[PDB]
Amino acid sequence: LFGLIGAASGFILQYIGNLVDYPLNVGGRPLDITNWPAMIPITFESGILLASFAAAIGMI
Amino acid sequence: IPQLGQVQMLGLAAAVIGIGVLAAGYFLSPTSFFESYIYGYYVAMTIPLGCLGFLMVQHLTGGAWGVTVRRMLEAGAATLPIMGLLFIPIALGYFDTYKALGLEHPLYEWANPEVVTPGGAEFDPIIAHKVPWLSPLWVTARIAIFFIIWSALALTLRAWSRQQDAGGDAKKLATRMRRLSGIGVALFVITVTFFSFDVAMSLDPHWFSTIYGAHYMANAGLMTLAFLALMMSRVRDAALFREYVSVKPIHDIGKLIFAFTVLWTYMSYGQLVIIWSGDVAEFTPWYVHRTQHGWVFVALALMLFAFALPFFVLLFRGTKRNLNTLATIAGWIVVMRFVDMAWIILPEFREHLWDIAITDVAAPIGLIGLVIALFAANVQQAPLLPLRDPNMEQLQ
Amino acid sequence: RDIYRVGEFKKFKEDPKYIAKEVYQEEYGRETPNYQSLQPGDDYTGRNAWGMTINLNACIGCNACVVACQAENN
Amino acid sequence: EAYLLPGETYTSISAKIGDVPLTPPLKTPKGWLAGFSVAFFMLMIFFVSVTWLFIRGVGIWGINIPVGWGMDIINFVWWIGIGHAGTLISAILLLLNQGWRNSINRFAEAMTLFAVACAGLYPILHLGRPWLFYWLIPYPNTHGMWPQFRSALAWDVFAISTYATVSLVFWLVGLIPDFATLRDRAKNIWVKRLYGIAALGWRGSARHWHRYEMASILLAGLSTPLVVSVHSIISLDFAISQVPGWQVTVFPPYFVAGAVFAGFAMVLLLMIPVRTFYGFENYITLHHLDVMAKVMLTTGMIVVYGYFMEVFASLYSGNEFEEYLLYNRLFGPSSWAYWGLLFCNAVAIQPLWFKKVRQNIPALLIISLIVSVGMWLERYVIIVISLERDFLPSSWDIYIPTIWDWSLYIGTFGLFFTLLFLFIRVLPMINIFEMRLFLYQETEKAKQR
Numbered sequence: 001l002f003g004l005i006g007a008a009s010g011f012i013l014q015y016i017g018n019l020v021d022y023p024l025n026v027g028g029r030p031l032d033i034t035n036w037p038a039m040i041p042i043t044f045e046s047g048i049l050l051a052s053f054a055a056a057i058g059m060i
Numbered sequence: 061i062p063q064l065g066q067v068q069m070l071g072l073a074a075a076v077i078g079i080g081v082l083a084a085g086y087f088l089s090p091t092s093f094f095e096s097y098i099y100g101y102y103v104a105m106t107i108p109l110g111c112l113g114f115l116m117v118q119h120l121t122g123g124a125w126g127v128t129v130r131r132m133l134e135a136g137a138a139t140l141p142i143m144g145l146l147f148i149p150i151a152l153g154y155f156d157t158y159k160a161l162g163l164e165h166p167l168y169e170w171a172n173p174e175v176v177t178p179g180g181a182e183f184d185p186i187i188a189h190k191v192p193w194l195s196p197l198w199v200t201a202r203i204a205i206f207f208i209i210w211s212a213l214a215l216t217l218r219a220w221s222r223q224q225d226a227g228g229d230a231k232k233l234a235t236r237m238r239r240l241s242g243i244g245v246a247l248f249v250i251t252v253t254f255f256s257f258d259v260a261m262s263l264d265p266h267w268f269s270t271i272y273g274a275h276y277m278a279n280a281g282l283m284t285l286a287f288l289a290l291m292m293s294r295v296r297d298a299a300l301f302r303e304y305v306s307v308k309p310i311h312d313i314g315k316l317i318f319a320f321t322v323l324w325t326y327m328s329y330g331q332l333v334i335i336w337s338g339d340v341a342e343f344t345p346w347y348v349h350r351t352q353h354g355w356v357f358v359a360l361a362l363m364l365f366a367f368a369l370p371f372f373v374l375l376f377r378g379t380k381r382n383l384n385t386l387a388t389i390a391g392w393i394v395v396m397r398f399v400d401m402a403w404i405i406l407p408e409f410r411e412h413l414w415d416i417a418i419t420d421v422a423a424p425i426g427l428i429g430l431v432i433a434l435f436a437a438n439v440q441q442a443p444l445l446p447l448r449d450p451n452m453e454q455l456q
Numbered sequence: 457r458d459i460y461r462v463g464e465f466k467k468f469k470e471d472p473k474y475i476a477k478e479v480y481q482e483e484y485g486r487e488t489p490n491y492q493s494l495q496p497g498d499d500y501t502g503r504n505a506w507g508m509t510i511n512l513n514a515c516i517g518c519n520a521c522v523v524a525c526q527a528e529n530n
Numbered sequence: 531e532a533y534l535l536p537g538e539t540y541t542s543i544s545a546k547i548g549d550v551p552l553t554p555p556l557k558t559p560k561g562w563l564a565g566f567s568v569a570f571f572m573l574m575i576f577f578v579s580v581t582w583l584f585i586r587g588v589g590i591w592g593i594n595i596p597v598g599w600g601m602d603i604i605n606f607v608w609w610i611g612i613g614h615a616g617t618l619i620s621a622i623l624l625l626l627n628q629g630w631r632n633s634i635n636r637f638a639e640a641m642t643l644f645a646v647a648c649a650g651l652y653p654i655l656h657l658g659r660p661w662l663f664y665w666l667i668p669y670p671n672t673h674g675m676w677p678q679f680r681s682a683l684a685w686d687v688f689a690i691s692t693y694a695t696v697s698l699v700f701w702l703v704g705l706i707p708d709f710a711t712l713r714d715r716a717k718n719i720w721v722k723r724l725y726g727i728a729a730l731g732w733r734g735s736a737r738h739w740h741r742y743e744m745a746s747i748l749l750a751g752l753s754t755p756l757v758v759s760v761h762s763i764i765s766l767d768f769a770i771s772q773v774p775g776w777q778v779t780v781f782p783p784y785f786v787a788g789a790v791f792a793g794f795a796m797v798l799l800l801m802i803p804v805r806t807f808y809g810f811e812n813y814i815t816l817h818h819l820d821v822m823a824k825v826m827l828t829t830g831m832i833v834v835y836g837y838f839m840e841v842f843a844s845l846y847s848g849n850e851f852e853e854y855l856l857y858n859r860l861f862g863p864s865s866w867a868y869w870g871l872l873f874c875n876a877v878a879i880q881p882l883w884f885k886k887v888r889q890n891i892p893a894l895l896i897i898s899l900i901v902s903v904g905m906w907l908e909r910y911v912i913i914v915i916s917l918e919r920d921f922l923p924s925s926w927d928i929y930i931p932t933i934w935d936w937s938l939y940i941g942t943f944g945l946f947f948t949l950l951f952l953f954i955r956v957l958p959m960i961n962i963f964e965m966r967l968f969l970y971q972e973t974e975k976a977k978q979r
């Protein structure tokens with residue numbers, strides 16, 4: 001549950017921050033969903049963090 | 061054993077059907093026959109190479125899953141010499157045998173005299189810069205040397221495994237195979253990497269990728285793992301599994317399939333993001349063709365059907381403990397692996413999704429049918445699960 | 457490398473594009489480098505697009521542009 | 531050979547591992563005091579280096595315009611790679627069901643936490659405006675500015691933060707039973723209540739071990755792609771760029787293999803004295819060193835495979851810049867690092883193939899030292915040499931490091947060893963409950979013959 005929330009949170013944060021709230025053009029990189037490369041790492045790291053925290057805190 | 065014979069008959073029927081329609085496509089068009097035969101040879105080579113690699117890996121690190129499918133890995137790896145003879149048609153393509161057999165232009169760009177020779181009509185300096193390395197004599201010599209290495213390793217390991225059923229299993233025939241697998245792993249990595257460079261990557265001499273080849277090993281490992289799960293579900297009641305195999309080896313192999321699926325996705329995404337963010341023009345045409353004329357839909361299907369769907373299904377403790385469910389997932393994985401290779405190889409020839417012909421579907425099934433038939437004959441040759449093995453205690 | 461390009465006026469008169477057709481033949485075998493990109497970029501159609509051109513036939517290395525840039529941009 | 535030799539008892543493991551801590555402060559061995567004094571001296575060197583770097587600036591290093599990344603990034607990649615092997619031992623081996631991780635997972639994971647703590651300073655120290663590091667973090671501000679998230683340094687911030695937090699909570703989860711065994715043997719009343727709140731009143735019982743084992747399995751299954759993605763991102767920071775020597779597609783797995791390569795070398799270098807000093811020869815046997823050297827040899831062979839792929843790529847392409855990269859590595863002004871690379875991580879790792887060398891302790895110490903030097907030389911060859919000579923020949927210059935970045939290097943070694951000496955003094959360096967469980971498993975295996 002927390003891992004899927006974590007992954008979704010990371011993708012939402014990146015999309016809103018750089019493709020919605022302040023649409024900066026950086027190096028001609030796309031501002032659409034075609035910017036799906038370079039959004040995988042932050043999303044993956046966020047999901048792992050929430051999932052790991054849930055396991056340790058949950059066991060306790 | 062009867063289930064293995066039924067699988068052998070099914071593989072023979074699929075092989076003769078594929079060869080027949082492949083010969084029909086050759087008579088209709090001689091070029092498209094070789095274009096599809098390259099892709100069929102590349103996709104059918106994954107079972108024997110992956111079987112040999114996993115056999116040597118499980119010898120280095122002994123486990124329950126390794127002893128469970130050791131004889132099956134030896135039977136799959138023993139088909140490598142027949143595969144070398146199957147390379148003869150491809151070698152005939154890039155040799156002077158062209159202008160015959162219906163080939164107007166040579167099968168490979170680096171074998172056309174109009175390109176690699178300075179002063180030619182189609183001189184390309186980038187392709188011609190590799191004229192001593194990318195030569196029909198040098199490529200055939202490298203391929204033959206790799207086949208001698210692979211056949212020698214597979215036949216020696218199988219012969220030592222057969223001799224283990226006679227005597228002296230603890231002192232010898234278990235450490236010798238471990239040391240041979242230790243040096244063989246480095247040998248197998250180098251040979252397969254350069255084999256992938258020569259057969260598939262040399263189709264476009266303007267592009268190269270260092271991660272490529274390792275992507276091929278992870279791809280072949282996922283294919284042979286799903287193939288092993290399917291064949292384990294087929295022969296689950298051979299009176300040898302029933303008395304020595306529990307749910308632990310099935311769970312370990314399911315975990316290995318899950319780990320190799322995320323490994324393949326990790327390699328493919330790594331290559332993509334490296335080429336995508338660094339927009340260098342010498343590496344962009346590869347991902348341009350694979351995202352053009354409908355080929356993007358193939359990539360999107362691989363992203364979802366070959367990553368997310370297997371990742372979530374195999375995430376649970378179930379669906380990997382149950383052999384039936386794991387075999388069903390392995391069948392979907394096998395189907396997806398065929399599409400992935402089509403996405404890598406077929407765009408070079410067809411250049412359109414609609415331009416894909418019937419021979420592009422015929423050659424993979426036609427050659428994997430011969431691979432399955434030889435695998436079933438080699439697995440019926442000897443009994444499964446070597447009883448005389450110090451690692452057999454790991455099954456208790 | 458293709459840092460500095462030099463030609464002759466007698467050949468430039470017949471074809472002003474002959475210098476670019478060279479190099480690309482020795483590098484690729486064709487007269488045009490079919491560079492392909494994976495990034496879309498931006499449009500810049502109806503808007504102002506600031507650009508600069510440096511004529512190598514007029515540069516003499518007087519280093520006046522460097523002192524002007526230093527005096528203008530702190 | 532066996533991973534547990536003598537007829538140990540559960541109380542034998544408990545007393546032998548519990549006697550290293552809980553020793554009265556006046557009974558501390560003199561060797562610990564000498565090592566901690568050396569580590570504290572190097573820590574003062576670290577404090578002087580950081581203080582002067584903050585006062586003057588990053589201009590005290592040898593970085594210039596072409597080479598904007600010097601040893602401030604080399605030592606960072608070196609340190610962040612040291613902990614990959616310990617994360618592999620503490621997580622990957624748990625999934626692989628390997629029995630030789632029970633006696634070295636605690637010390638290895640401690641090395642990961644300390645190496646990550648040392649590597650976590652360079653992204654702040656090399657900044658030039660260090661106090662603004664939080665601008666890379668998405669925080670609510672009075673401006674409305676976001677990080678780019680399309681650069682690899684934003685991935686790097688999220689990766690190190692996740693790596694450090696997950697490794698810390700996993701280490702503490704593994705320490706909870708050992709905390710319970712310590713507060714049960716602490717004797718003194720105020721030494722108790724300290725491990726007691728650390729153990730959270732563990733009360734080792736069923737309905738608790740079940741959730742403990744499942745959470746530990748999930749944590750290891752999650753931390754394996756975590757550390758892989760971390761070092762893959764530390765590889766992406768160079769691979770995303772357009773530098774000829776940096777845009778190499780095989781960098782993610784090559785960096786992962788190199789990280790675990792240098793990690794196993796450092797772990798062998800630091801565990802052999804730990805094994806031979808304390809009476810731990812019954813727990814860390816010679817078969818441990820054998821299999822660890824085998825893994826180190828395999829990872830070194832994957833690194834050599836990466837060397838060959840780079841050479842094949844430079845020879846295969848007709849690009850002037852890949853060819854000059856190979857020429858500048860082979861006969862350039864900095865070719866010494868490439869030759870040291872080829873000598874260290876390619877020639878010196880070959881003796882590991884044999885068994886007599888794999889069972890020799892001094893040979894393992896020398897090989898581990900040579901491997902660590904070669905890994906530092908490889909990071910130097912990848913970064914500095916590639917950055918020295920770029921596309922425009924006029925933008926060519928040489929990179930000569932100063933004394934202050936060296937002072938930071940020795941200083942980071944001292945902080946690393948200070949934290950390690952404090953860990954081996956306060957907490958048990960071998961996981962106790964995992965060792966007695968391994969003894970129970972070996973007893974059951976001997977019962978079933």
Ligand code: SF4
Nearest residue numbers: 515516517518519521
């Ligand atoms: S100011 Fe002098 S150096 Fe600068 S561009 Fe003009 S001629 Fe060249």
